[PDB]
Amino acid sequence: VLSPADKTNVKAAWGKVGAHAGEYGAEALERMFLSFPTTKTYFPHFDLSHGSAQVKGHGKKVADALTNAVAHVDDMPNALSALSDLHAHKLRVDPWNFKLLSHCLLVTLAAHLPAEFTPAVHASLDKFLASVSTVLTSKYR
């Protein structure tokens, strides 16, 4: 899985995101709903309009989940535990959508962290998001 180099690359990049984690998270979500409309069938009770307080509020929750995944990068399973049943069992989210969010998240990061989004850090985040997604879908198989 995530190597020592990846682990440090992830921590660094997220450190930069800093207090913006919540707004970047709201931005990724918006990018997804726009570029990938099928993912909206999951937020019907949401006003997905641009300056939607609901979207902004959820982007914060997503960002904090990710912050926690990083803080416990060596034990994401036990940590993300709850989030796994919610997504996998409760909402039964199509696994393929995790790929779409992960992509919009990298797009968001690349549009804010020009200095940090190097090839290596890029692959690292990919692996990281790849792992986080694996856990959130771990309840499927």
């Binding site: 931005e27 918006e30 990018r31 726009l34 570029s35 992509h103 919009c104 990298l106 797009v107 968001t108 690349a110 549009a111 804010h112 020009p114 989004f117 890029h122």
Partner: peptide
């Protein structure tokens, strides 16, 4: 991704879509 990195804040969500 490359384009978002290159254009940054200009690569708005709508442009991406």
């Amino acid at each position: 991704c490359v384009l978002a990195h290159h254009f940054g804040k200009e690569f708005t969500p709508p442009v991406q879509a």
